Design a protein around this nucleic acid. Structure first.
Ligand code: MG
Ligand code: MG
Ligand code: MG
Ligand code: MG
Ligand code: MG
Ligand code: MG
Ligand code: MG
Ligand code: MG
Ligand code: MG
Ligand code: MG
Ligand code: MG
Ligand code: MG
Ligand code: MG
Ligand code: MG
Ligand code: MG
Ligand code: MG
Lengths: 78, 112, 93, 139
RNA sequence: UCGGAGACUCCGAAUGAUUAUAACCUAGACUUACAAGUCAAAGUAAAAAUAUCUAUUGACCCAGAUAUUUUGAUCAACGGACCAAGUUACCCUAGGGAUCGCAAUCCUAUUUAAGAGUUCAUAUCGACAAUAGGGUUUAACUCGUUGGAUCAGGACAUCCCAAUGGUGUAGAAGCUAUUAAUGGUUCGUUUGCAACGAUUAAAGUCCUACGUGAUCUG
RNA sequence: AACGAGCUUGGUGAUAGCUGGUUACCCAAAAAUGAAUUUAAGUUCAAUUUUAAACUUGCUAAAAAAACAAUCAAAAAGUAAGUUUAGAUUAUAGCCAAAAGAGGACAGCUCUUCUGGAACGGAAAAAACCUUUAAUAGUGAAUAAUUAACAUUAACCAUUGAGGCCUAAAAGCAGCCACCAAUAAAGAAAGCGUUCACUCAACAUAAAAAUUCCAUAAUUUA
RNA sequence: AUUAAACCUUGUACCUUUUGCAUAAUGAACUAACUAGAAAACUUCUAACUAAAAGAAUUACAGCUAGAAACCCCGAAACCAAAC
């Protein structure tokens, strides 16, 4: 089947977008060595929050007022 | 070789080989559907779930490696700060242009 | 219609993006008292504010990273150049 | 289908443009003029090859030769030589009746052997003249 | 069933010979559905450390043996029912279905022609090759709807009618080719379809789930 | 009044790895690979999946270096999952496209391995290809795939000593061996002519398959 | 949707079933009534008392006692007994 004209234009535009993405990824701000350890502190704190949530699972408090509140269903006007 | 720039490439895109930009503006332009499972994961790792939603990422080698895997599914535009980085006072008045400039003052008035 | 042109002008390709048309309030009171902020704008402000904070955090982390790299190259540089003790020779040392 | 889609994706005519910008035969024409004093120009009558030979051979018995050269290569010397009025004559097939003696009358007589062949003119005794003049000199 | 080799084709086994005879106990691991099968430090004990290759399987139950240690399967359908064959068109039920390679010679066809050749409406054939076909040797021991009658619809790759080219077309018979789907395109005998006899301008080739069994029939 | 072995009652609610069926709303997560089996219309285990609980590193990536594009994997970084314990099933036939082997160091075909998919949009057809992060009200908006394609030939001239030879005798010549000579330029000639004795090449040369086609239409407005 | 019942636009019955596809293949003329998930070994949740719990015999190196929470329907060819 013949390749449509509009189809060729569409893919050519997509090729240009991806080709430019090569350019912007060719200029690393920091080298490999300079990266090591720069974000260690933030990562460690994030994991600690994850651990705290996992080990905080436990049942909930129970109150006499909640259970005694059921008696209010029979409230009336004198 | 693909990621080694050429002198003409710098002129076309107007980017200096020195003083490289720091932050990428990355948006998802195409679907993860019908893509290999590994490409699906990288998109979610980078946070590009909703298309046409810009996300700020570091221009560092580790991030670049992941960004290259999904090179075909996204558009990368260098972030620009004409008026400098936002401060605490101006943090609530920021606005990102389609051009890629994060202005720190948004008045909604004619420029004049 | 005409979306590429709006980008050349620096506007949002969609007219329903960032602009006075959407972000400005839709109405006020007759007396002039401003109306409560529209729910949509409050959500939109949060995303920019949240995005703004991420920009600040990432730059600070990257800047501090290379500074530490500078300290490493220095402390290591001075460590390499070192000497101690004494260095005789010949038939006795 | 995308595979086919990818495959399709992957000033002045030289015509109107202006175009960038015999020696052995020359001696032969000079040789006949030097060797033969009189050159008579007669139109080549397209005679049969066998009949053409005997006329040349018969003249050879009379020590008279027949010489023929292409007209276009013959123009230059005829332009600058003792014989200059033969240029219009030397158009189309032609023959030269060349001899060592001024046998102008006998040349016509040999020409009269074939009545259809006419004589256009030439030079006799190094003097260029037309046929009407040649007949007067032949007397 | 097991294992060796090749990438399904081949080889072996339910191990034998050699063995101055090979303990017990116990860290960590391999393998693996399970069950089974592998290697082993340390400690301890005999003696003066590993039997030797090649490789080799069978559970539980239950029966045997002995003075406390051991043995029982072509259970080979090899995860093994303690012990059971045919036959059904006389059949039945529950359902599911459908209704290309190489070689080895030998033939041939076209292009080769090594050769010979050839001799007044007088000649070529053809080694050897190349190429297309058909067989043979070369690798285990039987077969899978449809005539006819009635009515026909369409295709043209035209059987006849019609219009033409060429001719090795004198006239008369023909042969070769193109265009054309207009109407037509037989009756019987032997009878399982294949022949046959008489004719015709011709007795076309095919498709329409045997074209067509709620139209009929073998 | 249907005998390969009567009928009625009872056993009996016979049994069926087989066929059929199995009744309100809402939210959420969610797969036909390995092993054995009188096993392949079944079941059991592994693997997967799931609800809860415990506590801590997990996924992508993973430099050098091994054993040779993988088996393995360290600092990092992007990011939130992974391991263990208790409980529990159904499932164990795929379908199609695109890659790579392997069967005859083939294509195909049958397998095996990896990848992807299951529109309301698009592709004459249209679960499988391409565009598509869930679902909600609005007489808002920007967009994706795609809406087919305009892609070389000619009319010109043609010379003897008949070379001898078995073919009277062979002229460029039936024929056979030589295959020449002059010539501006000619092959004992290309055919032809000729029992011997019209012209091409040369020279000279203007050029080069079966019911009935099947949207309609349209060459130029930036 | 509409001013307007129909014209205009959009739209390949249902269930079961096959692969996660049907223009298939099963089943339904329609109405009313009837017509198919049932058990507590292990687990989870909730309480009583607690080195003990249980209204006799049971269990226990935090247990023990009680509560709640679970596993369908229709259909053969046949086989045997005894009458007719
Ligand atoms: Mg085991
Ligand atoms: Mg030891
Ligand atoms: Mg068996
Ligand atoms: Mg077995
Ligand atoms: Mg086994
Ligand atoms: Mg019988
Ligand atoms: Mg019988
Ligand atoms: Mg008919
Ligand atoms: Mg025809
Ligand atoms: Mg008859
Ligand atoms: Mg019928
Ligand atoms: Mg699998
Ligand atoms: Mg079976
Ligand atoms: Mg079964
Ligand atoms: Mg019915
Ligand atoms: Mg039953």
């Amino acid at each position: 089947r013949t390749v449509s004209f509009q189809a060729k234009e569409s893919m050519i535009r997509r090729l240009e977008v991806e080709a430019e993405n090569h350019y912007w990824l060719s200029m690393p701000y920091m080298t490999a060595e300079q990266e090591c350890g720069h974000a260690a502190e933030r990562r460690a704190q994030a994991f600690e929050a994850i651990k705290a949530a996992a080990t905080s699972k436990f049942p909930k408090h129970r109150y006499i007022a909640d259970q005694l509140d059921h008696l209010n269903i029979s409230k009336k006007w004198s | 070789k693909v990621f080694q720039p050429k002198p003409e490439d710098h002129e076309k895109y107007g980017g200096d080989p020195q003083n490289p930009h720091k932050l990428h503006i990355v948006t998802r332009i195409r679907s993860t559907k019908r893509r290999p499972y590994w490409e699906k994961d990288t998109i979610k790792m980078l946070g590009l779930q909703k298309a046409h939603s810009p996300q700020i990422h570091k221009n560092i080698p580790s991030v670049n490696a992941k960004l290259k895997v999904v090179k075909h599914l996204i558009r990368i535009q260098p972030l620009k700060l004409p008026q400098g980085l936002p401060t605490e006072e101006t943090m609530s008045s920021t606005c990102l242009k389609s051009t890629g400039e994060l202005v720190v003052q948004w008045h909604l008035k004619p420029v004049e | 219609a005409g979306g590429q042109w709006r980008l050349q002008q620096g506007l949002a390709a969609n007219p329903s993006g960032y602009g006075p048309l959407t972000e400005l309030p839709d109405w006020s009171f007759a007396d002039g008292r401003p109306a409560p902020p529209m729910k949509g704008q409050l959500r939109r402000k949060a995303q920019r504010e949240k995005l703004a904070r991420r920009v600040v955090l990432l730059t600070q982390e990257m800047d501090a990273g290379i500074q530490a790299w500078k300290l490493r190259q220095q402390k290591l540089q001075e460590e390499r150049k070192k000497e101690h003790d004494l260095k005789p020779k010949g038939t006795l040392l | 289908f995308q595979r086919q889609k990818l495959m399709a994706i992957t000033a002045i005519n030289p015509r109107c443009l202006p175009p960038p910008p015999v020696r052995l035969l020359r001696q032969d024409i000079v040789a006949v003029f030097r060797d033969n004093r009189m050159i008579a120009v007669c139109q080549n009558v397209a005679l049969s090859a066998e009949d053409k030979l005997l006329l040349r051979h018969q003249l050879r018995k009379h020590k008279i030769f027949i010489k023929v050269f292409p007209s276009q290569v013959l123009k230059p010397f005829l332009e600058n030589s003792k014989y200059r009025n033969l240029l219009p004559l030397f158009v189309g097939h032609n023959l030269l009746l060349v001899s060592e003696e001024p046998k102008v009358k006998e040349m016509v007589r040999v020409l009269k052997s074939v009545p259809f062949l006419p004589l256009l003119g030439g030079c006799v005794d190094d003097t260029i003249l037309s046929r009407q003049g040649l007949v007067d000199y032949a007397k």
